[PDB]
Amino acid sequence: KWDYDLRCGEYTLNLNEKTLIMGILNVTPDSFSDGGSYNEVDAAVRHAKEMRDEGAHIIDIGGESTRPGFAKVSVEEEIKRVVPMIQAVSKEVKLPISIDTYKAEVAKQAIEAGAHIINDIWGAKAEPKIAEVAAHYDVPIILMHNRDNMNYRNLMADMIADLYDSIKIAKDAGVRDENIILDPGIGFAKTPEQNLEAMRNLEQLNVLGYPVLLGTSRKSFIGHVLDLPVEERLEGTGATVCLGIEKGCEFVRVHDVKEMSRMAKMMDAMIGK
Amino acid sequence: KWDYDLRCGEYTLNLNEKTLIMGILNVTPDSFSDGGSYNEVDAAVRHAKEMRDEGAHIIDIGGESTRPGFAKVSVEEEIKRVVPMIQAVSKEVKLPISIDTYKAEVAKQAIEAGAHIINDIWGAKAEPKIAEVAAHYDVPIILMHNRDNMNYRNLMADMIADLYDSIKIAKDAGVRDENIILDPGIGFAKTPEQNLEAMRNLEQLNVLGYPVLLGTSRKSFIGHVLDLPVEERLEGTGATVCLGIEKGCEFVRVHDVKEMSRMAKMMDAMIGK
Numbered sequence A, B: 001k002w003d004y005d006l007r008c009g010e011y012t013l014n015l016n017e018k019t020l021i022m023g024i025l026n027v028t029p030d031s032f033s034d035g036g037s038y039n040e041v042d043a044a045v046r047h048a049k050e051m052r053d054e055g056a057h058i059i060d061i062g063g064e065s066t067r068p069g070f071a072k073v074s075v076e077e078e079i080k081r082v083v084p085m086i087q088a089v090s091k092e093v094k095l096p097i098s099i100d101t102y103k104a105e106v107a108k109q110a111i112e113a114g115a116h117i118i119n120d121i122w123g124a125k126a127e128p129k130i131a132e133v134a135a136h137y138d139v140p141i142i143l144m145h146n147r148d149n150m151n152y153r154n155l156m157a158d159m160i161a162d163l164y165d166s167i168k169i170a171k172d173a174g175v176r177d178e179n180i181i182l183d184p185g186i187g188f189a190k191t192p193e194q195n196l197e198a199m200r201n202l203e204q205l206n207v208l209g210y211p212v213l214l215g216t217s218r219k220s221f222i223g224h225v226l227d228l229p230v231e232e233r234l235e236g237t238g239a240t241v242c243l244g245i246e247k248g249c250e251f252v253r254v255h256d257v258k259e260m261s262r263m264a265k266m267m268d269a270m271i272g273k
Helices: A038-053 A075-090 A104-113 A127-138 A155-173 A190-202 A202-208 A220-226 A234-246 A257-271 B038-053 B075-092 B104-113 B129-137 B154-171 B194-202 B202-208 B220-226 B234-245 B257-271
Strands: A005-010 A012-015 A018-028 A059-064 A097-098 A118-120 A141-144 A180-183 A251-254 B006-008 B011-013 B022-025 B058-061 B097-100 B117-120 B141-144 B180-184 B249-255
Touching: A005 B022, A018 A038, A018 A104, A038 A059, A059 A075, A075 A104, A075 A127, A104 A118, A104 A127, A118 A257, A118 B117, A127 A141, A127 A155, A141 A155, A141 B058, A155 A180, A155 A190, A155 A202, A155 A234, A190 A202, A190 A220, A190 A234, A190 B058, A190 B249, A202 B257, A220 A234, A220 B257, A234 A251, A234 B234, A234 B257, A257 B194, A257 B220, A257 B234, B006 B220, B022 B038, B022 B257, B038 B058, B038 B075, B058 B075, B075 B097, B075 B104, B097 B104, B104 B117, B104 B129, B117 B129, B129 B154, B141 B154, B154 B194, B154 B202, B180 B234, B194 B220, B194 B234, B220 B234, B234 B249, B234 B257
Parallel strands: A018 A059, A018 A251, A059 A097, A097 A118, A118 A141, A141 A180, B022 B058, B022 B249, B058 B097, B097 B117, B117 B141, B141 B180
Antiparallel strands: A005 A012, B006 B011
């Protein structure tokens, strides 16, 4: 199905052999520092090593300004916390690293510090310069579906058009087709029922001809269906992962790496991936 | 999709609202009795109550002569162990009960003791009289795909023909169309790779026009794909359950009721069941 591999500097990800597992690493900030402190960075490194041992193929690193917390923090402050984490994790864990940011300067510094992939929740629409950064370093970029409003004429048709507007911003900046990945942005600018409709119709995203990453891990729409708190959504998340793989996704972005890796491996064998 | 409900005596199962969860109860025999002993029966009752509390819609009860153990035991001995369990569980737990047996006399005594459904791993081919029993009591019967040999010309085509031969045995005995359920018999008369092929093509079974039950829980083909022992197959089983629901199954037969109920409920909401 894919006539190329995802090239991530020193690493190469085959898109045909197996579903790729992206483990989520969120910063746990230390109370008396701006970043780079032993306890904070050691926590990150230890969690990245655990995710590696349980099946992760990519480690996704997020500072304070991104999900789930969305803290208002300047670029300078975000770089102080994020750069040390990327430096240590990239040296100590032999997997590609993704930087989860919509800010062009954060992405640039992150790539300089050793990151391999840009993961953008605004799909180059918040800061179009992130696509120039991506084109310059020749790195993969994930463009997520996102929106300021929630009035859809036709949810799936509108998502595809919005993602297309992202792809045009990326291409115009010189990002190569082989460096583009799409994400339906489940849990963003969508009601619970729109989240369910997007899951039901995910295979439609395949028509754009790019690899798709699914990120549903522990999201509130699962709690909504199940009536369960965030620490009790492992099974709900597993269901979304299985359906996503069935509908043709190439990556899943997950917190519970051990459990989701097993579920993905079983799915792969049944669908004949 | 279904223009009728499954009628189980005092209970009625709607086939359209949700995937139906069948919890597996296997006998744990007491060392100094033939059956009916407090410890043995109390264990059964307590496990049936736990499965009920975590989401089971049907309790499936199996004696020593059935899976997983396949002990060689006479009909008289099997009735001594199974009948007391059905009597206590049916009185104390308000759910339909399925008897897992291929023996016509076991099924008859089980129904007399309070069972509502016959679950036959030989699909009325081992003892054709089981279909006369089913027709007489007007109870649902599950006909599983099974075979003495393993030389398939075309696995799916052959499974459908074999299931059809079962349906003909049932109809000829007077079993009504609304009382027939089919099961692909994953883990029976199939190599690991044939088990994977059947999962991949499960939707083909829908052409026969009967409800389908899937029973994959903890099976060796999961261990084969994952390289994991029987107590570590929860995630592998969940994957089979999700794909099965996606491919249109109406029931799943599972050991891990709490976890599979959550996974089924999430799937139902995404597919729009």
